[PDB]
Amino acid sequence: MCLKLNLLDHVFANPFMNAAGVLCSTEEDLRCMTASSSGALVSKSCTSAPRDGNPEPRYMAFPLGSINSMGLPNLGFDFYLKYASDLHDYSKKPLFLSISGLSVEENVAMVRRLAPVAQEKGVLLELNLSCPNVPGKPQVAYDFEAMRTYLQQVSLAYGLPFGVKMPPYFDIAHFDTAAAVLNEFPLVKFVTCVNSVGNGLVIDAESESVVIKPKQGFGGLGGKYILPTALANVNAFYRRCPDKLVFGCGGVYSGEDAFLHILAGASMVQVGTALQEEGPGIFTRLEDELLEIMARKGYRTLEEFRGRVKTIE
Amino acid sequence: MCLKLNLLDHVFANPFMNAAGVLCSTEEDLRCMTASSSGALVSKSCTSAPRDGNPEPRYMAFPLGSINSMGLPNLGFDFYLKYASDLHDYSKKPLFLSISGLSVEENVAMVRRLAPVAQEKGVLLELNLSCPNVPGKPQVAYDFEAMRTYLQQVSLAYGLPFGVKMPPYFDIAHFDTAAAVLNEFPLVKFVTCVNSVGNGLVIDAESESVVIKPKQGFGGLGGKYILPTALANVNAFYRRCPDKLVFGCGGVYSGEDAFLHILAGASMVQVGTALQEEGPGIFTRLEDELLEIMARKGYRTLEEFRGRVKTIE
Numbered sequence: 001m002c003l004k005l006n007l008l009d010h011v012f013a014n015p016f017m018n019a020a021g022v023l024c025s026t027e028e029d030l031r032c033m034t035a036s037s038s039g040a041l042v043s044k045s046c047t048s049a050p051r052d053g054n055p056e057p058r059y060m061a062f063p064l065g066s067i068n069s070m071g072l073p074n075l076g077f078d079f080y081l082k083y084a085s086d087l088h089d090y091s092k093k094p095l096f097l098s099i100s101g102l103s104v105e106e107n108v109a110m111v112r113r114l115a116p117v118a119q120e121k122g123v124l125l126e127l128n129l130s131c132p133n134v135p136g137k138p139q140v141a142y143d144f145e146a147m148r149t150y151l152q153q154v155s156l157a158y159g160l161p162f163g164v165k166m167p168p169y170f171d172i173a174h175f176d177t178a179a180a181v182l183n184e185f186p187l188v189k190f191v192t193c194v195n196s197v198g199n200g201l202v203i204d205a206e207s208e209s210v211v212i213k214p215k216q217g218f219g220g221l222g223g224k225y226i227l228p229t230a231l232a233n234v235n236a237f238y239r240r241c242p243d244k245l246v247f248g249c250g251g252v253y254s255g256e257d258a259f260l261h262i263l264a265g266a267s268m269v270q271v272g273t274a275l276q277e278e279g280p281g282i283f284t285r286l287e288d289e290l291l292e293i294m295a296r297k298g299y300r301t302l303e304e305f306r307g308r309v310k311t312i313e
Numbered sequence: 314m315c316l317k318l319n320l321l322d323h324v325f326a327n328p329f330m331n332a333a334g335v336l337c338s339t340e341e342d343l344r345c346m347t348a349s350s351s352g353a354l355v356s357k358s359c360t361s362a363p364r365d366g367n368p369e370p371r372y373m374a375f376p377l378g379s380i381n382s383m384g385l386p387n388l389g390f391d392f393y394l395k396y397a398s399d400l401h402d403y404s405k406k407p408l409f410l411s412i413s414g415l416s417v418e419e420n421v422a423m424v425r426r427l428a429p430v431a432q433e434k435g436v437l438l439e440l441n442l443s444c445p446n447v448p449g450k451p452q453v454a455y456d457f458e459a460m461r462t463y464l465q466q467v468s469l470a471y472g473l474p475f476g477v478k479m480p481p482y483f484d485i486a487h488f489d490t491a492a493a494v495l496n497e498f499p500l501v502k503f504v505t506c507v508n509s510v511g512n513g514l515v516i517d518a519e520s521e522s523v524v525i526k527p528k529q530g531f532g533g534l535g536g537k538y539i540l541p542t543a544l545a546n547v548n549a550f551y552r553r554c555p556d557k558l559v560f561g562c563g564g565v566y567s568g569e570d571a572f573l574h575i576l577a578g579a580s581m582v583q584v585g586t587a588l589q590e591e592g593p594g595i596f597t598r599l600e601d602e603l604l605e606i607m608a609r610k611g612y613r614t615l616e617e618f619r620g621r622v623k624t625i626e
């Protein structure tokens with residue numbers, strides 16, 4: 001039994017990869033993720049220009065998960081593009097490049113440049129629809145007209161299959177609306193659910209203080225707090241986007257957690273907080289654990305159960 | 314050292330109360346909450362007509378919290394109004410009555426009738442703005458124009474101080490907008506943050522099945538999953554609504570979790586999942602745990618720390 005799979009015209013040794021932003025920012029990080037047992041990797045979301053990001057401390061983890069307000073620190077698009085074009089060893093595993101411009105125009109400019117590298121090398125695009133707060137307007141994926149604009153413009157400019165990284169939704173009407181938008185774009189071939197649960201607040205009782213510095217301690221939540229949110233969003237989009245793939249992200253610490261993501265509809269399973277905390281060895285454990293649950297159940301392939309979560313009546 | 318609060322022209326022995334929907338549906342429930350050491354109680358969110366609610370199973374709990382899609386089962390308004398006007402012993406503690414009409418007109422009809430009982434007996438209204446509204450549209454509090462309509466009409470029809478039960482938000486733009494809507498209504502004297510984290514999905518690995526029957530397993534999340542989200546919302550509203558009280562609700566299992574809520578700005582602190590699981594005994598434990606934290610830190614009253622969460626630099 002091996003967990004090998006094929007999608008988006010690429011072959012993957014297993015469905016696991018990092019979540020964007022974790023262990024993917026520097027050349028060192030990308031080489032480490034490449035040397036790991038993961039089935040693929042994704043680069044840190046990039047802007048046209050390098051960014052320092054927010055002041056530290058900007059990430060903290062606890063037994064139940066993590067909070068971050070990194071501020072999109074990154075080495076800039078030229079760096080990730082050169083990684084994709086010249087440094088990445090595509091014989092080891094596929095590469096996804098995540099883009100998160102501060103405007104539609106910045107995204108268009110990055111994707112025009114990415115396209116010939118995607119054609120030549122097979123790098124895959126994940127377009128990150130979450131961005132820093134701008135007072136007076138919601139994050140793009142929470143503004144459906146802006147989301148439709150971004151996707152129209154990126155689709156025209158890029159002209160090749162790509163995916164989108166989505167924040168979680170919490171309302172069935174929103175799921176219906178969001179999926180309807182994504183279904184207008186045939187080049188959107190995969191949807192990644194979810195980004196961190198926005199603007200949580202962790203407080204330390206002893207010190208009576210928030211635990212990250214930026215945004216008065218408010219940041220996105222990852223980890224065990226978010227698993228049922230992530231599963232709901234994976235399944236909602238899996239149901240609503242039958243001609244697309246869904247990539248699951250959120251709360252994966254174990255092969256069991258991955259199993260639940262795949263039951264819900266996930267093709268690839270991304271690991272964020274648990275990867276940040278445990279390091280890249282986690283990928284061998286997750287593989288072993290997922291194969292062990294499969295063997296106990298008699299499943300030989302992921303296809304056998306992907307999306308097969310049972311409902312009651 | 315004491316847990317006493319005075320607010321809304323009422324006196325409370327301590328800040329703890331049940332969350333609406335837990336241990337509050339029947340006369341038996343309400344008498345149980347009254348006999349408990351809670352500082353107050355709130356009645357189950359009601360509609361004009363009694364409702365059976367959704368098919369079972371419709372609530373399930375786990376180590377990290379709960380999921381529910383109860384479907385607003387309740388004994389109807391006339392019952393909760395009679396409890397308030399004739400049966401509740403107000404010398405024991407104060408009562409909140411929660412309403413959750415299915416249209417603005419149904420809420421108006423209920424509040425018009427509640428008003429004389431509120432004035433004469435001192436029952437306090439909590440209007441649930443997670444009331445579903447038109448199917449295919451978002452819940453009312455996620456539709457700011459509907460929220461404004463509901464609050465104009467209830468304000469006119471009731472004419473007395475009341476409070477609102479809010480869903481969590483995840484985007485700073487929504488904190489901004491929601492709080493600005495609330496701040497239009499001077500009779501909204503308290504804001505209860507938060508209702509359940511909407512439309513999560515819990516999946517049982519062994520059975521490969523969702524765990525509740527309604528909504529193909531999707532329901533609202535409560536408990537340990539949602540404490541940082543709850544704390545963020547209490548603090549966001551505390552900071553934005555300086556002329557209103559904030560009540561905290563979400564993830565309280567211990568005196569320490571209550572202490573955090575209060576550092577975030579909570580006046581009263583409600584308890585849902587942990588009360589559902591542990592029963593009314595939890596209130597003595599929470600009181601004891603909170604007084605122990607206060608004594609260690611030399612705090613003699615709640616006011617000494619309410620809203621005093623520190624931020625970094």
Ligand SMILES: Cc1cc2nc3c(=O)[nH]c(=O)nc-3n(C[C@H](O)[C@H](O)[C@H](O)COP(=O)(O)O)c2cc1C
Pocket residue numbers: 019020021022044045059066068070072098128165194195196221222223224226249250251252270271272273274276
């Ligand atoms: C430190 C940190 C940096 C992150 N940066 C990004 C990013 O650059 N792009 C992105 O799409 N998501 C980013 N995320 C979100 C994750 O990819 C992921 O969606 C989220 O952490 C939830 O998954 P988890 O429960 O496995 O942590 C970041 C998360 C963390 C913790």
Ligand SMILES: Cc1cc2nc3c(=O)[nH]c(=O)nc-3n(C[C@H](O)[C@H](O)[C@H](O)COP(=O)(O)O)c2cc1C
Pocket residue numbers: 332333334335357358372379380381383385411413441478507508509534535536537539562563564565583584585586587589
């Ligand atoms: C079984 C159940 C029923 C609920 N019914 C109501 C309701 O009728 N009205 C309401 O405002 N919130 C209701 N809620 C939400 C709770 O009041 C509370 O906001 C939510 O459970 C989060 O708090 P917790 O983490 O302590 O559970 C209900 C929650 C549960 C678990």
Ligand SMILES: Cc1ccc(CCc2c(C(=O)O)[nH]c(=O)[nH]c2=O)cc1
Pocket residue numbers: 021045068069070071072073100128130131132133195196220
């Ligand atoms: C406040 C904020 C800043 C920047 C982003 C985009 C990058 C990003 C970040 C980040 O770099 O802060 N963290 C996440 O959890 N998800 C993300 O998508 C999202 C929100």
Ligand SMILES: Cc1ccc(CCc2c(C(=O)O)[nH]c(=O)[nH]c2=O)cc1
Pocket residue numbers: 334358381382383384385386413441443444445508509533
């Ligand atoms: C789908 C749906 C139906 C009815 C409501 C309002 C009552 C309510 C319920 C409920 O009765 O299902 N559960 C909660 O966690 N919070 C609530 O406010 C909320 C959602």
